[PDB]
Design a protein around this ligand. Structure first.
Ligand SMILES: Nc1ncnc2c1ncn2[C@@H]1O[C@H](COP(=O)(O)OP(=O)(O)O)[C@@H](O)[C@H]1O
Ligand SMILES: Nc1ncnc2c1ncn2[C@@H]1O[C@H](COP(=O)(O)OP(=O)(O)O)[C@@H](O)[C@H]1O
Ligand SMILES: [Mg+2]
Ligand SMILES: [Mg+2]
Lengths: 183, 742, 183
């Protein structure tokens, strides 16, 4: 079999199979709901637009981000995001694909616990693992030492690694990110 | 024997001469084999066994003493010159060597070896291959006919005609020892039983693009040539289909210090054709080119000039025009100029930029590309993410690896396209019913400086040997169920597969090597440390190396069917990577030359497409071997072994270590070892009565009474209804007590 | 055959074949252990860095000297030092090579006995001998009389020798040495 690498991120969900040089599906992590009434009868609008589809209907929806700074705050929206990613984007059954997930440092343990519970129960993934963003960034950079500054849309943090050994007491996390820049 | 004309003597001696040669002095007690220093063993007579000291007088007159725990019997005269090694009374490692030696001394070229066929190339013309033998041979079965290639060929033809299943022929031997002429005579026999000229005409084209000079042989072949011979509905020759497998790409870029590259580049540098050099702007000095000068520049293997002209003539008389030939030469010249590319670091960035561009300009001019676009593609490869294209950065090491991978890939595509063109030209319009496959593969080459290229060849040969062992086990079980003598149902595959599982399976040597190159800070010391951590003591085959006679380097030693082999780690990690570049392949597809045909297709609802970076030579090798095994296993196989008699051209003389090495790499010792654990000696009841009834002068009751008086243990024999099986020791005991009886 | 002259000392292990002008391998006698966890997988870090390697990884290792004042207090670390010296720095098998050892005057008998036992049992050297670190220094000076002051890193001692006859009753040993100066 083959492994599946899913990166929830923040403001952009990117996923794809392991051994690929680039993620297959990249789309914003947005769940939108219609805020108006709707007068035409027969079309039958769905009650939730998820993913890149909400960008097309941006003018008649209330876009809500399921996560604020790394931490998931609206879990149901996150099941919707993961279901969309697994079915309408990759078109694969997660029943036979191990899933690798990426998660920021210095976050509540309940977050990881709920993530693993959702993966094992709702989607019945055979196996899964959770890793730190900085270690993956250092992997992709062709390096074994050096301090890495990971600044996404949710949170900015630095993790120093020397010779494959981390320095947990030197990890600094700053909540300033792209969303605050937009505001 | 009158049917076999005047070629019978070589084919089989007469009964009269056999009986005349039967009676000659031989003492079984003290004329046994003895170890030697010059060779593995020599023929000698032991004066006496004085404890742990013996005195053996060899034919050279030496009086050397040897340890008593490595002595072993010699063949009695009544069993000498046996046609089949499986019927030999005592199975010993050099006993087969000496039997073959004294058979070639009397010029018996062909010798049965159970499921194997041993054929040593004669150095003089023989009447055996006269077509009068071929015409009159028909009507004889394998069992009655003395050994020859025609026997197994007719057996395979009969099996195809009656059993209605495909049959395949597997030949093993070093190139240049007569393999080509052997295949020529085999296909001639096939034509007689009903396109030999076309095959002979197209052979030099494949030979010139697939052979290279190594330490062992000056004309060593690498790729796994495979020819399928098709037949009509009424069992008549219809057409021939040719395929290639397991062509090695590492030879193109990395060569050993004392070995050459493919003959292609050296042949192009021939000065007798001046037009190609000036029209391609090729530097006439081989020293200047980087890809070629690393290995040995030139040897007196074959004079390249008239060989090149012969290949050009063969292409000219073939179906396609000269423009395709010119495209071939210009593409090869472009492959040559890929080593002149140079790259340097930038101002204040880790990115790499070219310094010289003249070689890039000329290469782009030849390929019909744009130099600026090619340089931009090499330095800044475009990649697709989601729905948007982004550009990736490359340093010097990655761009050098990509340059090498592109050169290897384009050569592979050119060779495959040439093979397809040859197959199309050879193709006739006759229908293709059941086929007869012919397989040629490189042997189990052994060096004192084994590396990755030799490792792949050894692993392929070991897989083939495991397949042969499984087939022989199936045949033995079939014979057992036919005779109703069925015991020891344990399979003979897993014993050899234990070593296979430490190469191809996960956590194997190949898997760890493939993973290690992906880690961006891997080094040879770390790779060796990981191998020791994951395999030393944990596995039953991986073990420490040995330093013998001042060998240059050894890092780890494996155990195979051919013995102990050690490999050198140094240099493996660098040459395993094959990172292809997608944007360059797209640029080739956008080119104005024929090159787009070769690279026409190259690299959601379930995908496992490996990325360009995640590309290793080892993975491609495993995939090709697996796809070959998914094809060969569908046909009933037959085996042909070719053995060189001596290193020199002089006929008659032999080199015993050379014959030992040939036997070891051919797997004959493994065959006799597998045969010896069961009951290899099988004699009919009537023959046993006419030979051994005289021992107790006076059929199940009679045989039982006779064997009960010989003090034969219950577990030493198997009592059947048609044939009775004996152990090797029983035959020796019977021979000795017959000797004392007479 | 040839003889190996190993000089453990304290803080610097120096060794080489007998008859050489100068020692062949000189490196600090320290054993390093990684005090962090390691986040990068697949590297396969060794659990103990020994010898001159530990000097290059000072920032992620804790360094413990196996010899405090002449005497050996951590025998496993000393065995690791000896194994490294025999198999990496010199790359010679001690199966067929006698060894000459040195130690300071006035040391516990258990230390010498255990050193001898380990060197015959673990390494199986054909023969070995223990010499006073001061008499050898007297040989190296081309003298036969006079006192010698061997101030190393572990211990400082004086051995008066006259015409090759040592005077045991006048030997003075002092525990002040280079380590105390560094502290
Ligand atoms: N070219 C650019 N210039 C400036 N900001 C950018 C650019 N591209 C993306 N961003 C910002 O980066 C954010 C996306 O960050 P992302 O990598 O998805 O974070 P995470 O990995 O935590 O999901 C967007 O919100 C956007 O504001
Ligand atoms: N020139 C110098 N200046 C200061 N200190 C020195 C000098 N040379 C050596 N040392 C000290 O001496 C110590 C090593 O002494 P050494 O004779 O190797 O002891 P041992 O023989 O017990 O290993 C080191 O710790 C070092 O600090
Ligand atoms: Mg991120
Ligand atoms: Mg000292």
């Amino acid at each position: 079999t083959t492994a599946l690498v899913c990166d929830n991120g923040s403001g952009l969900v990117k996923a794809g199979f392991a051994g690929d040089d680039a993620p297959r599906a990249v789309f914003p992590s947005i769940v939108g709901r219609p805020r108006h009434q709707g007068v035409m009868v027969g079309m039958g609008q769905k009650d939730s637009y998820v993913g890149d589809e909400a960008q097309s209907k941006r003018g008649i929806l209330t876009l809500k981000y399921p996560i604020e700074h790394g931490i998931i705050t609206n879990w149901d929206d996150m099941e919707k995001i993961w279901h969309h990613t697994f079915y309408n984007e990759l078109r694969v059954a997660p029943e036979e694909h191990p899933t690798l997930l990426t998660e920021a440092p210095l976050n509540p343990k309940a977050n990881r616990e709920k993530m693993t519970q959702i993966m094992f129960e709702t989607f019945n993934v055979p196996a899964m693992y959770v890793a730190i963003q900085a270690v993956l960034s250092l992997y992709a950079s062709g390096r074994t030492t050096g301090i890495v500054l990971d600044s996404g849309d949710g949170v900015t943090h630095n993790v120093p690694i020397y010779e494959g050994y981390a320095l947990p007491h030197a990890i600094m996390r700053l909540d300033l990110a792209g969303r605050d820049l937009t505001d | 024997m009158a049917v076999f004309g005047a070629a019978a003597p070589y084919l089989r001696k007469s009964e009269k001469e056999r009986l005349e040669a039967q009676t000659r002095p031989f003492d079984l007690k003290k004329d046994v084999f003895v170890p030697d220093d010059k060779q593995e063993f020599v023929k000698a007579k032991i004066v006496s066994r004085e404890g742990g000291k013996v005195t053996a007088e060899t034919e050279y007159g030496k009086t050397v003493t040897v340890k008593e725990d490595q002595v072993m019997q010699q063949n009695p005269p009544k069993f000498d010159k046996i046609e089949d090694m499986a019927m030999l009374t005592f199975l010993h490692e050099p006993a087969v060597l000496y039997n073959l030696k004294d058979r070639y001394g009397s010029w018996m070229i062909y010798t049965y070896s159970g499921l194997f066929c041993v054929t040593v190339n004669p150095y003089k013309w023989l009447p055996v291959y006269t077509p009068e033998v071929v015409a009159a041979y028909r009507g004889k079965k394998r069992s009655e006919a003395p050994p020859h290639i025609f026997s197994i060929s007719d057996n395979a033809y009969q099996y195809m005609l009656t059993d209605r299943e495909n049959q395949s022929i597997l030949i093993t031997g070093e190139s240049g020892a007569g393999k080509t002429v052997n295949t020529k005579r085999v296909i001639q026999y096939f034509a007689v039983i009903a396109l030999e000229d076309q095959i002979i005409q197209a052979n030099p084209a494949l030979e010139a693009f697939g052979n290279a000079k190594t330490v062992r042989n000056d004309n060593s072949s690498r790729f796994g040539k495979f020819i399928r011979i098709h037949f009509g509905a009424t069992g008549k020759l219809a057409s021939a289909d040719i395929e290639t497998y397991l062509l090695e790409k590492s030879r193109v870029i990395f060569q050993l210090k004392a070995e050459r590259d493919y003959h292609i580049f050296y042949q192009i540098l021939s000065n007798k054709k001046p037009e190609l050099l000036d029209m391609l702007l090729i530097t006439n000095n081989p020293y200047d080119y980087a890809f070629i000068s690393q290995g040995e520049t030139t040897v007196a293997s074959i004079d390249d000039a008239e060989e090149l002209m012969a290949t050009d003539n063969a292409f000219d008389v073939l179906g396609f025009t000269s423009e395709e030939k010119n495209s071939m030469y210009k593409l090869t010249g472009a492959i040559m100029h890929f080593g002149n590319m140079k790259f340097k670091l930038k101002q204040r960035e880790e990115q790499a930029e070219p310094d010289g561009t003249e070689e890039a300009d000329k290469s782009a001019y030849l390929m019909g590309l744009n130099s600026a676009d090619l340089l931009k593609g090499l330095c800044h490869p475009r990649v697709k993410v989601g729905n948007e294209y982004v550009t990736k950065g490359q340093n010097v090491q990655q761009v050098i690896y990509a340059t090498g991978a592109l050169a290897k890939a384009v050569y592979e595509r050119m060779f495959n396209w040439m093979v397809t063109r040859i197959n199309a030209t050879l193709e006739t319009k006759q229908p293709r019913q059941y086929f007869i496959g012919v397989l040629d593969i490189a042997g189990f080459e052994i060096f004192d400086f084994n590396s990755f290229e030799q490792l792949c060849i050894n692993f392929t040969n070991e897989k083939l040997q495991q397949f042969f062992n499984h087939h022989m086990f199936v045949l033995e079980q079939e014979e057992y169920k036919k005779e109703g003598i069925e015991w020891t149902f344990i399979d003979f595959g897993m014993d050899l597969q234990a070593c296979i599982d430490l190469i191809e399976k996960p956590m194997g040597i190949m898997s760890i090597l493939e993973e290690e190159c992906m880690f961006p800070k891997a080094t040879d010391m770390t790779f060796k440390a990981k191998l020791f951590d994951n395999h030393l003591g944990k596995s039953a085959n991986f073990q420490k190396p040995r330093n013998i006679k001042g060998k240059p380097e050894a890092h780890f030693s494996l155990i195979h069917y051919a013995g102990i082999v050690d490999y050198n780690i140094i240099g493996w990690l660098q040459k395993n990577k094959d990172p292809l570049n997608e944007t360059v392949v797209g640029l080739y597809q956008k080119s104005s030359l024929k090159l787009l045909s070769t690279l026409f297709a190259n690299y959601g609802k379930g995908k496992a497409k490996k990325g360009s970076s995640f590309q290793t030579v080892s993975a491609l090798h495993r995939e090709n071997l697996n796809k070959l095994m998914t094809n060969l296993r569908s046909t009933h196989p037959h085996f042909v072994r070719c053995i060189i008699p001596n290193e020199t051209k002089s006929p008659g003389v032999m080199d015993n270590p050379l014959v030992m090495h040939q036997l070891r790499c051919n797997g004959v010792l493994e065959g006799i070892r597998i045969c010896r654990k069961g009951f290899p000696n099988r004699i009919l009841y009537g023959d046993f009565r006419q030979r051994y009834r005289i021992l107790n002068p006076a059929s199940r009751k009679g045989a039982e009474k006779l064997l009960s008086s010989l003090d034969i243990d219950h577990n030493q024999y198997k009592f059947g209804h048609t044939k009775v099986f004996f152990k090797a020791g029983l035959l020796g005991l019977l021979e000795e007590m017959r000797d004392e009886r007479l």
